[PDB]
RNA sequence: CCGGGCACUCUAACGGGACUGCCCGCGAAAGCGGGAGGAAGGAGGGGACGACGUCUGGUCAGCAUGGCCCUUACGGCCUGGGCGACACACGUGCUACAAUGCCCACUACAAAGCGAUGCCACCCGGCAACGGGGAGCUAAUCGCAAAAAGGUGGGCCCAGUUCGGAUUGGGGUCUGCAACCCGACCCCAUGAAGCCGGAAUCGCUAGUAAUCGCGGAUCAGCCAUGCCGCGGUGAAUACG
């Protein structure tokens, strides 16, 4: 049981934060406990939309979100008639008064998250686990990328014995502090029991 | 002799606001005392990595603030036209007390 | 020390006698890195020697060093079964180390209770050729040279 | 006129004012066998002054702020150092062989957690 | 070396049960999970039970055990 | 962390020195930072994700 | 000596005032 | 010089000399002498008639002291232990009063300790 | 302190600097030795960072989760007790056995932190904890704060002591609805063991060990002699 968080690792570089906003003593842990409640629903419902990321800017009750999607439809609406209720949903939790953006996935075949689900799900749907492992690796690094790399956790197939599985590809370093890896991670509820997901992708360096 | 203080958790979020301060009312007021960085205060917070026993683990972790000043004395108009609405950074907060 | 042969850290030299020796004396008698009442004690101790001791303190010092360098000692070593105590040469580097700790040990093995003074007085009994750190040297010296059997074993 | 030198020491800054006259030196205000009033290690801060036949022709007026009065008679002595070096800048060739143009760069170890000093290391029994 | 105050501490369950009885007198017995509270004059010649955290012992309190607190003669723990 | 004893919310402490932090995710009450509202557990796994603005990693 | 709370030391170690180590 | 209940403390300090009284330490030393204006200095074989007699009136006659102050202490303690008092049953049990450990340390009130048989293999380091 | 002044210290942001780059020596090369300059070197000093895997390692008691079990209850509320028990055994520590020391007074250098009912200036009542009053601070501009070891002067005079503070009696403060069980603090009295520790055993290679005090998190208060961190003074030794 080694090796820290890829992005909590590099967030002075290669990585900015999901929040980021001023504050302080009185407010902070209140103006953050919100913050959770924010990304609680988002990953609730847009599931089918494809989350990967949910950005919460602030300056004053006008909070920014702007949550990234690999089908920027699915959230939006008919004519935009979701992100009616949706935009409105979130006023029913922060009086705050905030605006809600949309930003589409340019390849969710380079989205640590999307890839990690991608996989977290055939697996619930159950799909042979090595195989679905490979594909994954193939489409990211199929798709650009200097590197890829999954990780299924255990009871692979239901047996038994826990195992973890693998796959990789390519320059994947977790040690070189400047990679810009993505790190996503995906669970799996089943019928026998939870199965961690793991996604790695490397992209450029500097 | 208008005290603007701004503080920020990127050192960059700051040099870049207060610095756009400095540069607008330069040119309606005095001239600024320059952007003056002033001490910054982190909080540590120090914790077991894993759950469960294990009490040398670790790893630290610090919410570092950072703080600046600026001050434009002779106040006029224009200084409070060319910064009054003109700001653009997110990851900062200001108070100003003339 | 597996890799290198770990060199001798050299220290500043005596802010009165500008003799480097002195500097050894005075971490020897120093303890908690409280090395000015070290420094103290031995000057004043310097001054105990120029009073009852019509001679410079710094060659009264000098020759106790010299009388308590013992150079023969036993170490110990397993050679078939037992463990033979061979009796071998002392580095000068190891001498001096070995004197000067005596020293301050034997000097603060006396009566006196003036930290100040046992060390005067040590060190004087020491140039004479008597006090309890000059024992421990001839005790050295006679531990080996009546082990001088084993030391066929020269190490 | 003046001549100037900073100096610093395992967290400690001194002004060192170096000034063509007798060769007293004010620390902080109270005189140099005033501040260091009974430290056996005081005459250390001047020894790049014997070094060159100064003292005894020069002046100090100096600030000190940081640390301890040992660190501070190691900044001090550097400060002294680099002052006398904008005076002749010749000096180097004899003041540098010593060592005084150097920076301790000796500080404090952190403290690393598991331990109870940076090394020191908690002990254990019938491990 | 105790101390509380300015203040003696009492709850009043006990406090207004006990000299409510002193109205007619005494009584015969009583029972308080109060161990919290310091002993008043008012007290005296009672016979208040308190509780070990699981019984009620009866407690018979006298003027040589007066500014104390009830509990301090209800055992808790079993030893021996 | 049982639904039943996260009844800290409750205020009515009847006296408020019965009131207790409590972590604001997971209920883990034993060692919950103020500054947060957060457990060391989740403090350390928010800081990881990026979360926690400007909480980045300590180093000196 | 650091143990004996009613002394400078004592007073000191255990990070208070009193008598022996008066505010001033 | 004699003071009191069968005092003698000689050839010290006056304030050191009346700390060897039962109910005298540092604190009433300096004060005793304070008031009775000694100095706390003078060696007590050094003192005076007239000093000697202000400090055997002053002390005796302002503190309880000797026999009579261990007649008190015992007494009190004889009564918290009559009463069901709890503080009173840690003295009858021998057992620290203030409210300390005795599963260790508690030596300076049990006395030495008294080893029995035990249970090895159960890593009781 | 005042005007004034950014030089200096510093504050924090950026830029430079080290690469065996230059000189001599050996080498096929990598590089080893030596020397100059330099604040600094040959990885300049300390962190973050832990490979494929191992131990059926640890945690379902943080949280998550398969299966099993309980549902007037293996759920829930409450008051009180318990987690603080002791004939004993061990681990990690604190304080100490003293004169390179202890006590009183006077006087001097630090860093990193924290502060809204919160830090608490200063003044008053109290031996004191602390209480009353009340300024500033929203905290490089006010407070915690005194750094301690240290320097100077005095006392102690080798004694279980002006060492050492356990234990116990009494008085009292403070938080809190409430301090019997079971808080910390103050003052008086008490003043224990301990005079340097058997077999055995632990740490640390330099600003390290050793020693000295300072802050923080948790937190009403606090059992902190713990933990995380700060700076002060500052060694010995390494043949092998
Ligand atoms: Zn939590």
Redesign the pocket.
Known sequence: ????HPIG?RLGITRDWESRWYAG??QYRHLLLEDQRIRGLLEKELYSAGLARVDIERAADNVAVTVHVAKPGVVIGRGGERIRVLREELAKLTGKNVALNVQEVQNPNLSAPLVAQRVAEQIERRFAVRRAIKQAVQRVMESGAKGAKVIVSGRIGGAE?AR?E?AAQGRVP??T?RANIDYGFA?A??????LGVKAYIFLGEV | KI?I?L?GFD??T??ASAQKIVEAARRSGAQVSGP???????????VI????????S???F?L?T??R?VDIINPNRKTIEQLMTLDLPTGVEI?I?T | ??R??????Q??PDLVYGDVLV??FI????????????A??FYDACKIIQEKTGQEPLKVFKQAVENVKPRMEV?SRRVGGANYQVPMEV?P??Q??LA??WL?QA??QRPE???????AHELMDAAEGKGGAVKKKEDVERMAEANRAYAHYR? | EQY?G?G??????A?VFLRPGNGKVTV?GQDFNE?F???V?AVAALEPLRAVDALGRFDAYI????????????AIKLGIARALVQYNPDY??KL??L?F??????????????????????????? | ?????????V?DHLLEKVLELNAKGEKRLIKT??????IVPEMVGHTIA?????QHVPVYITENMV?????????????? | ?????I?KAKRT?????????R?V????????????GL?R??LR?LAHKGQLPGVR???? | ?24 | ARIAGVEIPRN??V???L???????????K?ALEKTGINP?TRVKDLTEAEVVRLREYVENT?K?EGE?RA??AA??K??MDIGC???L??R??????????????????????????KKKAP??
């Open positions: 049981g080694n090796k820290i690792f003593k009185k014995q973890t693998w977790l040690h502090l669970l509820r089943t019928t026998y029991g939870v | 005290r203080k503080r050192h960059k700051l040099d003056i960085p002033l001490p910054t205060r982190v909080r540590r917070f120090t990595r894993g759950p469960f026993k294990h009490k040398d670790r790893e630290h610090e570092r950072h703080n000043l108070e007390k | 020390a597996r290198r042969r770990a060199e001798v850290r220290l500043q500097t050894a971490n020897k008698i120093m303890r908690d890195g409280k090395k000015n009442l070290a103290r004690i170490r580095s580097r190891r001096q180390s000067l700790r301050v000097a603060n209770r003036r930290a100040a003074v046992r060390i190490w | 100037y900073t610093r020491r395992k967290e400690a800054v002004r902080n501040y009033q009974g430290l290690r600030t000190v702020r940081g640390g301890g009065k040992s660190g501070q008679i190691d180097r060739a540098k062989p060592g143009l150097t920076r301790d760069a000796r500080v404090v170890e952190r403290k690393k957690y598991g331990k109870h000093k940076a090394r020191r290391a908690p002990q254990y029994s019938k491990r | 070396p105790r101390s509380l105050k300015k203040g003696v501490f709850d999970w109060s161990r919290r509270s310091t308190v509780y070990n955290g699981k500014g104390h607190k009830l509990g301090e003669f209800a055992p808790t723990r079993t030893y021996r | 962390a049982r639904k039943a004893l009844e402490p009847k006296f408020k020195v019965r009131a207790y932090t972590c995710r997971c209920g883990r009450a034993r060692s919950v930072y103020r500054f947060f457990c557990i989740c796994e990693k300590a180093s000196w | 000596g650091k143990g004996d709370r009613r002394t400078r030391r004592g007073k000191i170690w255990r990070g208070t005032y009193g008598k022996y180590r008066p505010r001033k | 010290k300090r304030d050191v000399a700390t060897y009284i039962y109910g005298i330490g540092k604190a009433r030393a004060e200095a503190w002291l102050l008190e202490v009190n303690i009564r918290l709890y503080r009173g840690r003295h049990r021998g057992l620290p009063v203030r409210g300390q450990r005795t599963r260790t340390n508690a030596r300076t009130r049990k006395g030495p300790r008294k080893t029995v048989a035990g009781r380091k």
